[PDB]
């Protein structure tokens, strides 16, 4: 998994959103407030094997942090 929250080096970008993880093994780093950023969807995270064609669409708070919204309400269990 990631961590800290930080970009290259010390002092960069302005306020974004913060470098997170979520349910699914995708590091959402600095995207934009008020962006919406796309990820694919899961392809090895159970016993399943396939739906290798949806994505995971995560909202980006303007106030500067991470939404929990992603695909998966049009997406497939794997």
Known sequence: ????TTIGNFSGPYTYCNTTLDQIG?????????????????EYFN??????????????????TWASRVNYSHCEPI
Not at 1 to 4: D, E, G, K, S
Not at 47 to 64: D, F, P, Q
């Open 1 to 4: 998994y990631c961590h800290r």
């Open 26 to 42: 995708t590091c959402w780093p600095q995207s934009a407030p008020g962006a919406l950023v796309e990820r694919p969807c899961p």
């Open 47 to 64: 016993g399943i094997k396939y739906n290798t064609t949806r994505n995971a669409y995560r909202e980006c708070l303007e106030n500067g």
